[PDB]
Amino acid sequence: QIHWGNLSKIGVVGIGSASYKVMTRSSHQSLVIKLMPNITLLNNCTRVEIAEYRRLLRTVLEPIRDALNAMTQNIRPVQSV
């Protein structure tokens, strides 16, 4: 299909061929990011910092939760029609 002879007359050569494999994704596995650490062995020494951390997180987490709910609330079982 590729004409190596005519290409070689203008300085182009093939220096390797290979088969082509693509990654396809299958099966599933749930991964959970636990954002709140276990601090019990710190005896209330991080209470202010943890509360502030939690407050910063809410600004980030609420829009994502809302975006996910906006989609799944439009997904009903078939017989609702």
Binding site: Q1, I2, H3, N6, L7, S8, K9, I10, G11, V12, V13, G14, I15, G16, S17, A18, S19, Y20, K21, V22, M23, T24, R25, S26, H28, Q29, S30, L31, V32, I33, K34, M36, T40, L41, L42, N43, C45, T46, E49, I50, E52, Y53, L56, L57, R58, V60, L61, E62, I64, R65, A67, L68, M71, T72, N74, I75, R76, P77, V78, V81
Partner: protein, 367 residues
């Protein structure tokens, strides 16, 4: 079976529709959340497989727990309570910055986003190797490494009551498309006058039955037994550049070498293809210089004429001839000279369009 309320939703890409249904099929049921929420509360490790018999294993990761467990807790009765809090606060702000960077407003569509496992690295504590071992990846061969790094995650649940994010991943495996051959192309410069040219072709192309295609090597690894790509790599090639690769030398463009050199020679099929006008070529066997016929542009060096050749100071033994003796330049139709810098392209296109608008008035008056 589920149905999407398309009139209610109004607008959505195919990608958003399929990810939305996938979100319904893969999200945890409402009380698995309450169970998961309770399992998370009672754990204290950085990474932990949460197994509740009946339900599938859920891999839980806590991004600052190793620091708390290894650095803060052992100092608990040697540093002040204020200092302990200040130490953890610095980690939490740095961790929040990563959560914000990944899950904040720069994430355009959380429903259809696919986050690479490496982009999750900091959210998972700064390293992903232990996650991959818990999922069964050993790190023992390079292919498993490539597959493990091809994992992508989707968000399936965000808990604002207990602050956790549930993601679903899928395992990559290799899908061989036996009809596609990937080809690496490589060029040598040749001289026309005092100008040093080379033919402009892509570094990688693919053949696929009748088709020659472009090939994006960005997502590929060239393993010894095949090209492994984590994404589709094939893309269309214009018919003209396909004709070039099919032997139409006049369809191939060319440009001048950058700097002051090309690749003036190359070893291919045990022969040396060399621009011997631009570098010293010499037969080592006989001690005699190898001159390039001046109406030829390249020299094809094989053992029928020179078993051991010296080329730019490097001594190479060559095999029997696999490339014909060079033909005269006048027997080669060379293609158009081009530049690939974008401003040069734009300036020459603007000129061509202007020349074409002139031509647009002249051929009706005479005809």
């Amino acid at each position: 079976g589920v149905v999407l309320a398309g009139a209610a939703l109004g607008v959505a890409t195919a990608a958003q529709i399929t990810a939305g249904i996938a979100l319904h099929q893969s999200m945890l049921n409402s009380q698995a959340i309450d169970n998961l929420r309770a399992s998370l509360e009672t754990t204290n490790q950085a990474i932990e497989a949460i197994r509740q018999a009946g339900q599938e294993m859920i891999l839980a990761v806590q991004g600052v727990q190793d620091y708390i467990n290894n650095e803060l807790i052992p100092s608990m009765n040697q540093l002040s309570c204020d200092l302990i809090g200040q130490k953890l606060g610095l980690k939490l702000l740095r961790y929040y910055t990563e959560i914000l960077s990944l899950f904040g407003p720069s994430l355009r569509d959380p429903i259809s986003a696919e986050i690479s496992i490496q982009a999750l690295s900091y959210a998972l504590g700064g390293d992903i190797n232990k996650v991959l071992e818990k999922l069964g990846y050993s790190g023992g061969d390079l292919l498993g490494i490539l597959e493990s790094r091809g994992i992508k995650a989707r968000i399936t649940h965000v808990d604002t009551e207990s602050y956790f994010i549930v993601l679903s991943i899928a395992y990559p495996t290799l899908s061989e498309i036996k009809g596609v051959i990937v080809h690496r192309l490589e060029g040598v410069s040749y001289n026309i006058g005092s100008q040093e040219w080379y033919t402009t072709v892509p570094k990688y192309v693919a053949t696929q039955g009748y088709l020659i295609s472009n090939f994006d090597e960005s997502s590929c690894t060239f393993m010894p037994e095949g090209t492994v790509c984590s994404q589709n790599a094939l893309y269309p090639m214009s018919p003209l550049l396909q004709e070039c690769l099919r032997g139409s030398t006049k369809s191939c463009a060319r440009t001048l070498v950058s700097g002051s050199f090309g690749n003036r020679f190359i070893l291919s099929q045990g022969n040396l293809i060399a621009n011997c006008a631009s570098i010293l070529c010499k037969c080592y066997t006989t001690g005699t210089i190898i001159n390039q016929d001046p109406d030829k542009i390249l020299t094809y060096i094989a053992a029928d004429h020179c078993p051991v050749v010296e080329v730019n100071g490097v001594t190479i033994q060559v095999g029997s001839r696999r490339y014909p003796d060079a033909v005269y330049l006048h027997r080669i139709d060379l293609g158009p000279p081009i530049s690939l810098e974008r401003l040069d392209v734009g300036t020459n296109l603007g000129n061509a369009i202007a020349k074409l608008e002139d031509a647009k008035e002249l051929l009706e008056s005479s005809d």
